[PDB]
Amino acid sequence: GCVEVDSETEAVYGMTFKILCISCKRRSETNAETFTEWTFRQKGTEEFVKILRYENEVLQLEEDERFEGRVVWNGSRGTKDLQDLSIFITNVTYNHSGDYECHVYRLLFFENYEHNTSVVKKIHIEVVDKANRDMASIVSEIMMYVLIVVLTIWLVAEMIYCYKKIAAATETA
């Protein structure tokens, strides 16, 4: 009951966003205790800095003038077993244009067994003033128009050909 999706790279300036970090276990029926940390490295800078840490259904935000008041938790709620570790930022500025690392630490509890798992997710976020439509939509639009029109002209041309032929045959006899 989980699909590992990837967050969108392009983020519009001045409006909200959603950074996706989904890491679900290999078997759903299992139970585990999971907590996450986030590290952000702005472009130009070469060091990752912890920004937030979610654990025991609480969120800890480190001191960072570029992130206080403009980030909220938007992951799984109501349980300690976390598979959605996404965070929601309510105001995208040009500071939030870098590399995000989502470190998810999970402790799986089996019968007479406890397993420690660490997964690191990599997200690239680009901040642009205006949102650009993906090339796939443009290509699909142009192609659908092209096939529609070419099919229309082919159909009318064949109809005209058969019309002339049958009319000539009828007039002849």
Binding site: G1, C2, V3, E4, V5, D6, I22, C24, K25, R26, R27, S28, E29, T30, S76, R77, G78, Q83, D84, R106, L108, F110, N112, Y113, H115, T117, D134, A136, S137, S140, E141, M143, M144, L147, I148, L151, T152, L155, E158, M159, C162, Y163, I166, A167, T170
Partner: protein, 1294 residues
């Protein structure tokens, strides 16, 4: 004629003189023979000359030693003339009295009574103290008859004497055993009681007419010679394939991979890693909570997976106590015999798919199509023609006897030359009116509708109405009967049919009115629904069903009796064999050490197990029996039972089918000569624009329409339309839950939908202008296409305008799954099958009416028996059911539910008889034998409404589920099959064609293959005319050479079964050397046939088959050895090495018994192809619906991480499993979940959908519709293949 004479010594003197004269210097009349009635021409016995020593009455016995006795029942006995044992002279008055005893029907009656009471005593499990004497006299009785027979005749000494008939051997053996183990302390009871059952076989020798039935059964099974060989050959080759593919891929378990070396304890101590024990330790596995066997897995991409910290390896033992396995040829053969008879094959399907990958499903298709669908129908057809021949021969004997009766008639006719009557008629006056009969029928229908109105959660207001209605209807019916009984005669005119039945019903109703409701009333109120059958006089199909039911207890009664005796014998045999073992090893199979639900400790449970294996479920009980009583005895007994009982049931089915066919009618009564009073009752109720086309614009418009029609008819537009339909249908596959991962594909499909709908709109418009409005609207195909395109137009223009989140728009979005329902009118193969089904549909509707009204009676019976008794208190924390001591009823469970105790739940069984609607679903599950286990488990635990069930408190409720299977699942099938056969025969008669499911394009190829099948062979062979010298040419044409090559192929087959998963490396090396030797010998054979014969390598086709299998042999043998360099491909060598079994198909070379069967399969292949294409289309549509609906339900029961509805592949696999109607209950339970179980809101990471609950209505309708459609399609497939088999087998030419 009229020859009677005592066997005086001068008769023996002349007999011996005649034989001496014959020796010194021929067929008995079958009508006379022995043991049958005497022909009428001989007259009657004079005075008291019965049991007198008459002489033989036929030729061929005048000189031989013979001596004839007759009885008052007029049967013929032929004993020997010589004194028995040379001591007892016939006239010394010892043998005369014994013979007089033996010819008396009272002796047979006494023997029958003692046999029945003996078997009744064998029914008892624990031998009571007052039983030994009962056995003793039994033995004393049995030897009695033997003594008489010993007095009657000698021991096989000379002529027709004792110990000649096999039944004489049988009872001689039974008395020998009885007196061997009577007073002798030697003999273990578990070994003598199982042999004591041989007294039950004496029923056939005692009951008249059973011997002929047994002989007929043996004669019917006699013809099963080549089909058995073909079945074993197909099973062997498929088992070899499975063993080579799935070798060891069933013990794959996930063990904890990170090894705690510092904490690797040992039983002896001193730590250590100790491999081959670390993998055999149970605790180092992964078992899904709530399950028993550890989870399987696979190393492939599409196989199963296990959580972090676990990893797959071949460890432990195979599932199902190690019996379900592919590691050995024997186990593979068992597992594939489990597939030919589709019993619990879904478990093996899921296990192999999980442990080897989802790409192996193709294999399970083949075994299903050939090996489980073709072999079974082959066997059924063979038995069918055997029974046809037997029935025909019986008819010939009957008409021959009736014809000789004409000669006898000719001979005899030639040789001949207080005001009671007033009130009687008054109460009669209201009888001979159609109105009273119509009112009675309406009353019965209304009574049925009233009885169908009761449910478990019923208010007092409802029950008062139901009770007063029942009272008034009972009063009306009893008044009708009471008035009938005075009109004709108070004690007479009540035996003319249907007047004893209604009397019995009304008397039961009045008896039920009294006695109050002390006990047993629940079943007592279940016998009135028989008034429904009073409609049979007006319903021809119900009357036919009544005739079918009455044929079993009637003319075809001996077969039913034989089946009952066989079932009883098998039950007592199993109970006496494994009765004690189930208690000694009770927790070899059930961890609680309490006896399981299906044991063999008492007669009732043994009979239930026998009936279950008759129904088709036998492996589950076989494993339990194996785990407690060994493998050999259990396998032998279960195989014997499942063979013999199935054969008897099949014979009874065929006999009832034949009796239901028009042979029953003999013009004894006029065809519906009587008149139905309803017509006269109705009669007496009634008594009291259009512009021309030959103008400037009209002509142009006419050419426009003609050119539109020409464009429609052009066979380049149709192919393009079919391609567009295929593309549009395939575009619906990319709508799984992983759609968020593939954004670009989603966008492309979304934009291509517009192109597709525009194309179809243009096609519809052009078709409108071409065909015309009347022609477009006077056929179903264009109407269906118009409906599809109109719903697409709605979903397009509405979405473009907005309201994409509207409930109506979202509910119309899932209706897009009908897009594949457009190739039906394009493909001729689908269309012919569809229109044949449509033309035949009235008969199935007419019979479905009868089936529904019949099943309604059983549903009401269940409702009045299991209403609200399926509830039970449950503790979710410990997932255990409370016993009767903890809680007793709903009130106690509610008290236990005080405070925050939400773990305690008053749960209800999802499938139950709470009302007629759910009773119908329960009956459907029971009839198909899928999911009935839980229903009968809960039924036998029920005690009373509103109280916790107790384990096996109503054990005798199982009978209710047995009778239904006998009546609702067996005779209804007979009716359906008979009407289908009659309708198809009439369709073939009116059509005039040869096949229904075949297009005109396939009929020419049909006839061409028919000509090919009867083609004769020619063998023109010239000399090589070269240095070959022809010696090898004569060598290859030698029968010894062919025998040698066939024996070598057989040896290769034999050595291909010795491979074992746990074999040592030395055995692998030896097998590799042997296979290499065989391969090099085969290459030498190919070289020998090479360069010595070439001009015949494009005609016969066998040589090119050998040439194409051999090259595959060399590549798979040595290239596979080479691929280890710079390539791995672990699973590919097995596929290549499967080619080694190609040489096994060369046994078909001389296979004239089964070569015709394979040719019949070829002949029927295309008619099966059309139906399979239709079935695949239906599967695709239902799979799209399942993806659209049940892609997010909870993973419970049959729904898991690998067999579910999110993806197209998983849905396809599940639907293919459901096609054979295998475990559809498991895939229906998760949908029936409720908000108390499934969370209404639930986070789904990666998708916007919330919650994991399903719609019970949608799921129920989906599964029921799929079951009905699949049943119809499979029935059509069976009919087609059986017709083709009959056509092939009914051909013979010089």
């Amino acid at each position: 004629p009229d020859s009677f004479k005592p066997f005086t010594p001068e008769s023996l003197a002349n007999i011996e003189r005649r034989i001496a004269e014959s020796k010194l210097k021929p067929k008995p009349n079958s009508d006379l023979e022995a043991g049958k009635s005497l022909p009428f021409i001989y007259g009657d016995i004079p005075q008291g000359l019965v049991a007198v020593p008459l002489e033989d009455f036929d030729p061929y016995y005048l000189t031989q030693k013979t001596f004839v006795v007759l009885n008052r029942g007029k049967t013929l006995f032929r004993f020997s003339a010589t004194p028995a044992l040379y001591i007892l002279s016939p006239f010394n008055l010892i043998r005369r009295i014994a013979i007089k005893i033996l010819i008396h029907s009272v002796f047979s009656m006494i023997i029958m009574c003692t046999i029945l009471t003996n078997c009744v005593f064998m029914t008892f499990s624990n031998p009571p103290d007052w039983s030994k004497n009962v056995e003793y006299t039994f033995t004393g009785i049995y030897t009695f008859e033997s003594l008489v027979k010993i007095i009657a005749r000698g021991f096989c000494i000379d002529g027709f004497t004792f110990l000649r008939d096999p039944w004489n051997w049988l009872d001689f053996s039974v008395i020998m055993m009885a007196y061997i183990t009577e007073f002798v302390n030697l003999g273990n009871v578990s070994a003598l009681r199982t042999f004591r059952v041989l007294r039950a076989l004496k029923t056939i020798s005692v009951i008249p007419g059973l011997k002929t039935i047994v002989g007929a059964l043996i004669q019917s099974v006699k013809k099963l010679s080549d089909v058995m060989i073909l079945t074993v050959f197909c099973l062997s080759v498929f088992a070899l394939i499975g063993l080579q593919l799935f070798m060891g891929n069933l013990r794959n378990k996930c063990v904890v991979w990170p090894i705690n070396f510092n904490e690797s304890y040992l039983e002896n101590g001193t730590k250590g890693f100790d491999w081959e024990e670390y993998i055999n330790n149970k605790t180092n596995f992964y078992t899904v909570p709530g399950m028993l066997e550890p989870l399987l897995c696979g190393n492939s991409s599409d196989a199963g997976q296990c959580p972090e910290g676990y990893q797959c390896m071949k460890a432990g033992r195979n599932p199902n106590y190690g019996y379900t396995s592919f590691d050995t040829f024997s186990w593979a053969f068992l597992a594939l015999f489990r597939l030919m008879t589709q019993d619990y094959w879904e478990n093996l399907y899921q296990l192999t798919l999980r442990a080897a990958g989802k790409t192996y499903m193709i294999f399970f298709v083949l075994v299903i199509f050939v090996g489980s669908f073709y072999l079974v129908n082959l066997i059924l057809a063979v038995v069918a023609m055997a029974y046809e021949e037997q029935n025909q021969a019986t008819l010939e004997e009957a008409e021959q006897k009736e014809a000789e009766f004409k000669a006898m008639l000719e001979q005899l006719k030639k040789q001949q030359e207080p005001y009671w009557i007033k009130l009687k008629e008054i109460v009669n006056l209201i009888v001979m009116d159609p109105f009273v009969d119509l009112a009675i029928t309406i009353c019965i229908v209304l009574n049925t509708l009233f009885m169908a109105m009761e449910h478990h959660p019923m208010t007092p207001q409802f029950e008062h109405v139901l009770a007063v209605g029942n009272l008034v209807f009972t009063g009306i019916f009893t008044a009708e009967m009471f008035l009938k009984l005075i009109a004709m005669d108070p004690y007479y005119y009540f035996q003319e049919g249907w007047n004893i039945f209604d009397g019995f019903i009304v008397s039961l109703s009045l008896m039920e009115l009294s006695l109050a409701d002390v006990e047993g009333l629940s079943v007592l109120r279940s016998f009135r629904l028989l008034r429904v059958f009073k409609l049979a006089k007006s319903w021809p199909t119900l009357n036919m069903l009544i005739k079918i039911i009455g044929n079993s207890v009637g003319a075809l009664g001996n077969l039913t009796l034989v089946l009952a005796i066989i079932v009883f014998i098998f039950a007592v045999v199993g109970m006496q064999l494994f009765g004690k073992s189930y208690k000694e090893c009770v927790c070899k199979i059930n961890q609680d050490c309490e006896l399981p639900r299906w044991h063999m400790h008492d007669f009732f449970h043994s009979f239930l197990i026998v009936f279950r294996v008759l129904c088709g479920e036998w492996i589950e009980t076989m494993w339990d029996c194996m785990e407690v009583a060994g493998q050999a005895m259990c396998l032998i007994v279960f195989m014997m039972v499942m063979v013999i009982g199935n054969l008897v049931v099949l014979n009874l089915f065929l006999a009832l089918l034949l009796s239901s066919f028009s042979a029953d009618n003999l013009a004894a009564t006029d065809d519906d000569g009587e008149m139905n009073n309803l017509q006269i009752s109705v009669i007496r109720i009634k008594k009291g624009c259009q512009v021309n086309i030959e103008e400037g614009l009209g002509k142009s418009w006419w050419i426009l329409r003609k050119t539109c029609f020409l464009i429609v008819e052009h066979n380049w537009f149709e192919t393009f339309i079919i391609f567009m339909i295929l593309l549009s249908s395939g575009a619906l596959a990319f709508e799984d839950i992983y759609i968020e991962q593939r954004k670009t594909i989603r966008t492309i499909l979304e934009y291509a939908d517009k192109v597709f709908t525009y194309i179809f709109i243009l096609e519809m418009l052009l078709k409108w202008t071409a065909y015309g409005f009347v022609k477009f609207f006077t056929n179903a195909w264009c109407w269906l296409d118009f409906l599809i395109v109109a719903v697409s137009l709605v979903s397009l223009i509405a979405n473009a305008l907005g309201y994409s989140e509207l409930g109506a728009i979202k509910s119309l979005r899932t209706l897009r799954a009908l897009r594949p329902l457009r190739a039906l009118s394009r493909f001729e193969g689908m269309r012919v099958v569809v229109n044949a089904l449509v033309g035949a549909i009235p008969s199935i509707m007419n019979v479905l009416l009868v089936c529904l009204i019949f099943w309604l009676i059983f549903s009401i019976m269940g409702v009045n028996l299991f209403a609200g008794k399926y509830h039970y208190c449950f503790n979710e924390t410990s997932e255990i059911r409370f016993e009767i001591e903890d809680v007793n009823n709903k009130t106690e469970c509610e008290k236990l539910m005080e405070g925050n105790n939400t773990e305690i739940r008053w749960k209800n069984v999802k499938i139950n008889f709470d009302n007629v609607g759910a009773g119908y679903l329960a009956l459907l599950q029971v009839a198909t034998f899928k999911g009935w286990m839980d229903i009968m488990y809960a039924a036998v635990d029920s005690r009373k409404p509103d109280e916790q069930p107790k384990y096996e408190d109503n054990i005798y409720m199982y009978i209710y589920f047995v009778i239904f299977i006998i009546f609702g699942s067996f005779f209804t099938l007979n009716l359906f099959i008979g009407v289908i056969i009659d309708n198809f025969n009439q369709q073939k008669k009116k059509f005039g064609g040869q096949d229904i499911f075949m297009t005109e394009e396939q009929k020419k190829y049909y006839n061409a293959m028919k000509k090919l099948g009867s083609k004769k062979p020619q063998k023109p062979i010239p000399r090589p005319l070269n240095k070959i010298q022809g010696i090898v040419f004569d060598f290859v044409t030698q029968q010894a050479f062919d025998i040698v090559i066939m024996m070598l192929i057989c040896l290769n087959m034999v050595t291909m079964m010795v491979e074992t998963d746990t074999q040592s490396k030395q055995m692998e090396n030896i097998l590799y050397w042997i296979n290499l030797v065989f391969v090099i010998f085969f290459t030498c054979e190919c070289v020998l046939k090479m360069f010595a014969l070439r001009h015949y390598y494009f005609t016969i086709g066998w040589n090119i088959f050998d040439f194409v299998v051999v090259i595959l042999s060399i590549v798979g043998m040595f290239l596979a050895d080479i691929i280890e360099k710079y390539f791995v491909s672990p699973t590919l060598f097995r596929v290549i090495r499967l080619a080694r079994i190609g040489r096994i198909l060369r046994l078909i070379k001389g296979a004239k018994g089964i070569r015709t069967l394979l040719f019949a399969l070829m002949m029927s292949l295309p008619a099966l192809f059309n139906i399979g294409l239709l079935l695949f289309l239906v599967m695709f549509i239902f799979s799209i619906f399942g993806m659209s609906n049940f892609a997010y339900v909870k993973h419970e029961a049959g729904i898991d991480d690998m067999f579910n509805f999110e993806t197209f592949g998983n849905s396809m696999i599940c639907l293919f499993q459901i096609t054979t109607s295998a475990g559809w209950d498991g895939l229906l339970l998760p949908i029936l979940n409720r908000p108390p179980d499934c969370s209404l809101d639930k986070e789904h990471p990666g998708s916007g959908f919330k919650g994991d609950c399903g719609n019970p209505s949608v799921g129920i309708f989906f599964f029921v519709s799929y079951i009905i459609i699949s049943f119809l399609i499979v029935v059509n497939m069976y009919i087609a293949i059986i017709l083709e088999n009959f056509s092939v087998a009914t051909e013979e030419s010089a």
